[PDB]
Amino acid sequence: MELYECIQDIFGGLKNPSVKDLATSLKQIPNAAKLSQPYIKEPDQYAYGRNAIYRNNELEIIVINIPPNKETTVHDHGQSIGCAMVLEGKLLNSIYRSTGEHAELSNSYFVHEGECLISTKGLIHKMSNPTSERMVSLHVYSPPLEDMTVFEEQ
Ligand SMILES: [Fe+3]
Prior knowledge:
Pfam families: CDO_I. By secondary structure, the chain is mainly β.
């Protein structure tokens, strides 16, 4: 089938989904990697490619492409929860706690192809790509991202 057809089918009816619902939804996309290929974008504003392909008043779906040894900022997602499924490659997700105006590294783990990473509310994190290949992921945020807070390291 086709990605937007799949997205309307799976995500279009969700109302106040949990991070659990979002993860479950992402795993329901058949051939997510194949389907997402025409939406993968190269870095423009960011160190990583980022393409927002769907949005209603509940959620927002974004295609992310982190090149080798690139990373995001250390950030939270405002008032939003987030889930991400790795389409291709492997990312390291690092977790932080607020040490005041700043943030200290608290946890880190890998997410491999087909696996999901979760971002509960207020969660501070950074995705990076320590590997020699790109990493492509499919992200969902709910509500759609408004104000991202970026933190400075310890
Ligand atoms: Fe994030």
